[PDB]
């Protein structure tokens, strides 16, 4: 068989770290050396392991809150947010026991549409939204008037702007090519000869015919359409951000000692990055490629030959001979190949699907899609900062150490989550590291667990990088890459991989 399932391999455990003087725990972990693929056996999920300890030493985690402490959550909130009329705590502990409530916003307020999604951190490497990292329901008072159309919105405290900067860009390109070639040839020869004169008669005849018909037809269509729609601009404040309870707790529990597996679990739960600016929008993309070819072939040959004699004196003698020979060879070949890809982001399932249909939309459903995108937009452009920039002394003790731990772990994570580790798919399939195992995402018209099935006899193989080599020594710290993981040339190879085929840096 061509395929063999590769089972998941994870490392021998780390050394234990030292026991956390407060968290009273020590940690061990393994790296994933090789993901499972092609239904290879998955690893044990326990690439993390934990042991309890005695409290060998105190730790100064008891970060002083001058504000009110939200009794159940431990969120520190300013006393001006007591009796605010708003759950600025998690648990209304700010609003209990209040003699009088000073409702600041009498008005009806909506939240910004999709604003909660932007509060959740992204795995940048996978572009995947993860757990919540920022609390976009904290308002710290607020109650400034913000409007979009006739609706009024309560801006979260964390948000500097969410503003309906509205724009749309459309692109249509269509390239139709036809060529056809036709070649008919005919050749005909005839000969006759006679003699006649006791009597004698002689005759010779010959006929030859050759005929050739060759025809080829080639047709090509490329159509691409793209719509980029933009419906708001979002910016997060640069300073004094209010973290989500779950993220807050999960950061608190981070061991002061560097133990990669816990920071990896942090990234797996919440990602590596958070969004500081984004453009909210919708995307529609349509790409149709068609090639049609015909060939017709015909060769025809005919021969006749005659030789015929009579001799007379009555009495007569004679010989006469005739041949006919005929050949026809004919072939037809006809092929069509068609690919369509349609991509849609933002909008509503009805308009999403009716745009996903294989035909170009009516401008009504484009209008309906763009209207729906306002209320359920996607993120078109993002600008992000790494999640460690949230670990701040106003929230966490030892914050510089936790931050530096994250800084290292983020490098180790970027290395470990890289899909370079997977074996290449066949059929130009893209291996995606998806947990501890790797799934070949196959272009349609290629199929199976490795994209091993296709009915197309040839398909360009695009280049794939191998994993970059380890850091070279100082005097020009360096890494290298080889385009080895899928060498492009096969099957009328596609483009080579991008550079940098080697990369070099300060020590």
């Amino acid at each position: 068989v061509t395929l063999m399932p590769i089972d998941c391999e994870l490392s021998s455990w780390s050394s234990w770290t030292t026991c956390d003087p407060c968290q009273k725990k020590r940690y061990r972990y393994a790296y994933l050396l090789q993901p499972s693929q092609f239904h290879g056996e998955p690893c044990n999920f326990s690439d993390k392991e934990v042991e309890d300890c005695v409290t060998n030493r105190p730790c100064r985690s008891q970060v002083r809150c001058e504000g009110f402490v939200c009794a159940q959550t431990g969120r520190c909130v300013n006393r001006r947010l007591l009796c605010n009329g708003d759950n600025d705590c998690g648990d209304q502990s700010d609003e209990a026991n209040c003699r009088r409530i000073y409702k600041k916003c009498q008005h009806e307020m909506d939240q910004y549409w999709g604003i909660g999604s932007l509060a959740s951190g992204i795995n940048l490497f996978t572009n995947s939204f993860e757990g919540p990292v920022l609390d976009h329901r904290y308002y710290a008072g607020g109650c400034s008037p913000h409007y979009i159309l006739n609706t009024r919105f309560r801006k979260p405290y964390n948000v500097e702007s969410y503003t309906p900067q509205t724009q749309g860009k459309y692109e249509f390109i269509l390239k139709e090519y036809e060529s056809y070639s036709d070649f008919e040839r005919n050749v005909t020869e005839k000969m006759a000869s006679k003699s006649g004169f006791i009597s004698s008669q002689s005759d010779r005849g010959k006929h030859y015919i050759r005929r050739t018909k060759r025809f080829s037809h080639t047709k090509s269509v490329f159509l691409h359409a793209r719509s980029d729609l933009e419906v708001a601009h979002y910016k997060l404040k640069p300073r004094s951000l209010m973290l989500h309870y779950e993220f807050l707790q999960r950061v608190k529990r981070l061991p002061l000692e560097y133990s990669y597996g816990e920071y990896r679990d942090l990234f797996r739960d919440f990602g590596t990055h958070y969004i500081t600016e984004a453009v909210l929008g919708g995307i529609y993309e349509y790409t149709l490629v068609m090639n049609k070819e015909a060939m017709e072939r015909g060769d025809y040959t005919l021969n006749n030959v005659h030789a015929c004699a009579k001799n007379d004196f009555g009495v007569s003698v004679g010989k006469c001979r005739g041949i006919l020979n005929e050949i026809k060879d004919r072939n037809k070949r006809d092929t069509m190949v068609e690919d369509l890809v349609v991509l849609v982001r933002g909008g509503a399932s009805e308009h999403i699907t009716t745009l996903a249909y294989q035909e170009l939309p009516t401008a009504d459903l484009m209008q309906e899609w763009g209207d729906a995108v306002q209320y359920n937009p996607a993120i078109i452009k993002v600008k992000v900062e790494p999640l460690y920039e949230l670990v701040t002394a106003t929230d966490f003790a030892y914050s510089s150490t936790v931050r530096q731990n994250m800084k290292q772990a983020l490098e180790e994570f970027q290395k470990e989550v890289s899909s370079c580790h997977c074996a290449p798919c066949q059929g130009n399939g893209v291996p995606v590291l998806k947990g501890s195992r790797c799934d070949c995402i196959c272009p349609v018209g290629s199929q199976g667990l490795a994209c091993e099935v296709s009915y197309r006899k040839n398909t360009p193989i695009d280049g794939k990088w191998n994993c970059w080599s380890n850091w070279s020594s100082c005097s020009g710290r360096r890494k290298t890459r080889q385009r080895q993981c899928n060498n492009p040339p096969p099957q009328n190879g596609g483009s080579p991989c991008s550079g940098p085929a080697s990369e070099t840096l300060d020590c």
């Binding site: 068989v1 993860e130 005929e326 037809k332 209320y375 009915y455």
Partner: protein, 513 residues
């Protein structure tokens, strides 16, 4: 092949009754499934697990055990005490919320938001052996006193008010409450479609002929010979394959402090610390081999059409005609042969996973913008899980609020490895013609695709088709004496047939002794 013979279902004797569990007053025992009725066959009358009443002759205290935290009477659910009188019953007895005349304990007015519709399926356990949902593993409704909410991006529903002249959108659906067990629930509209379509056709055609005539006179003779052939071939092949994948939300289950379902909680409290395969196999049967910790909610449409046709024809002739005169005489003699054959197969599969019976059927019938749009609308009200990551059920125990369960977890691992051996569809016989073997309860079936029929799908209606093989399962573990234990398996159930592919898995599997 003709059908295999039937086999009767067979079970072992009852194992010895488990000693009466004090809190249950129940005795348990199990059998082993020695054989499913692979084909035809008498089904076993009896279940492979049995329980009976008892008296323990000893009390148990466990109702008191947790009582530092608020422990309900009905259930083992033990709650952080701020959940008492919180305003939301957190265990099914409501004992946390009865007599709460100190109503000041309420946490928040959140009941204005319903739970996420269709969140319950993510709470269910999963049986890899059958791809069926089990009982609930996660609590689908426990909130832990949080009012954490998810924005429903599709909340816009038209309304009309004849007392005015306004067409406007209603807002009831605008937010859902997120159950505690979801770390993430994330509405997001994506679609992708891919279509591939291909045609190849060839027609190849040759004719060839000779006529040879010879005549002589001395009396006279004339002769003519002919040889001729026609040989025509045609191949037609069409393939098209459509995939459409709408995503409407993603979810992720919490990896920590998982609050197990009341039923799973009680059943896990009932299992012994001592290994007892009957008990743990019953647990795996009820709650499934696996539980889910990732999500996409959506709809999928898939369409495939293949057509293959061929025609072959040939004609041949050879002849002689003669005449002579000395009285004049005429003869002829020869042979001609002719053949024709024609073949067509057309196979289409369309399937919709999604949001209404009506328009799932309509889109399964007639792919069109009308059915695409109306099914997409139906996906608003009833999305279906389109992708999910899962892990073995025992990995849930590591993460529960119950703390450590090392011994029970190792027992459940061992039991799962046996359960995944004993109930594997390997024990359903050879499903021929690419039929799918299924094992359910103590019985077997083949699901036979339309080109196939009979108790093993053994009689394809055509003369035959290329059918790939499938493995029998792995044999027993070796009685290892070296440090290594070994298991063998072969691609013979059925073997690759009519030129079909080998099954692709491993022949040899190995374990530490």
């Amino acid at each position: 092949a003709a059908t295999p013979a039937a086999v009767t279902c067979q079970l072992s004797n009852w194992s010895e009754w488990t000693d009466c569990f004090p809190c249950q007053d129940k005795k348990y025992r199990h059998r082993s499934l020695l054989q499913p009725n692979k084909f035809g066959g008498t089904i076993c009358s009896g279940d492979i697990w049995d329980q009976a009443s008892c008296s323990s002759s000893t009390t148990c205290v466990r109702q008191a055990q947790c009582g530092q935290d608020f422990q309900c009477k009905e259930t083992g659910r033990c709650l952080k005490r701020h959940l008492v009188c919180n305003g939301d019953q957190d265990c099914l007895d409501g004992s946390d919320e009865d007599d709460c005349e100190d109503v000041r304990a309420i946490d928040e007015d959140c009941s204005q938001y319903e739970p996420i519709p269709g969140s319950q399926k993510a709470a269910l356990g999963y049986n890899i052996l059958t791809q069926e949902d089990a009982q609930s593993v996660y609590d689908a409704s426990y909130y832990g006193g949080q009012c954490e909410t998810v924005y429903n991006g599709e909340w816009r529903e038209l309304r009309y008010d004849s007392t005015c002249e306004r067409l406007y959108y209603g807002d009831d659906e605008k937010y859902f409450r997120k159950p505690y067990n979801f770390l993430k629930y994330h509405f997001e509209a994506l679609a992708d479609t891919g279509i591939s379509s291909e045609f190849y056709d060839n027609a190849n055609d040759l004719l060839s002929k000779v006529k040879k005539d010879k005549s002589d006179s001395f009396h006279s003779q004339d002769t003519s010979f002919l040889n001729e052939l026609n040989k025509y071939n045609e191949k037609k092949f069409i393939f098209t394959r459509i995939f459409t994948k709408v995503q409407t939300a993603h979810f992720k289950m919490r990896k920590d402090d998982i609050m197990l379902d009341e039923g799973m909680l009680q059943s896990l409290m009932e299992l012994p610390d001592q290994y007892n395969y009957g008990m743990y196999a019953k647990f795996i049967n009820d709650y499934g081999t696996h539980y889910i910790t990732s999500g996409s909610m959506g709809g999928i449409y898939e369409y495939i059409l293949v057509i293959d046709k061929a025609k072959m024809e040939s004609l041949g002739i050879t002849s002689r005609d003669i005449t002579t005169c000395f009285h004049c005489k005429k003869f002829g003699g020869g042979k001609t042969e002719r053949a024709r054959k024609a073949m067509a197969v057309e196979d289409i599969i369309s399937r919709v996973r999604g949001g209404s019976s009506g328009w799932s059927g309509g889109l399964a019938q007639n792919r069109s913008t009308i059915t695409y749009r109306s099914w997409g609308r139906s996906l608003k009200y009833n999305p279906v899980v389109i992708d999910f990551e899962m892990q073995p059920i025992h990995e849930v125990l590591r993460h529960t609020s119950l703390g450590p369960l090392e011994a029970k977890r190792q027992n459940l691992r061992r039991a799962l490895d046996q359960y995944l051996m004993e109930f594997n569809a390997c024990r359903c016989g050879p499903c021929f013609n690419n039929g799918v073997p299924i094992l359910e309860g103590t019985s077997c079936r083949c699901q036979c695709r339309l080109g196939s029929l009979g108790a093993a799908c053994e009689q394809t209606q055509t003369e035959g088709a290329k059918a790939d093989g499938s493995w029998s399962c792995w044999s027993s573990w070796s009685v290892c004496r070296a440090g290594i234990q070994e298991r063998r398996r072969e691609c013979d159930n059925p073997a690759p047939q009519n030129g079909g592919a080998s099954c692709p898995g491993r022949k040899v599997q190995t374990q530490a002794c």
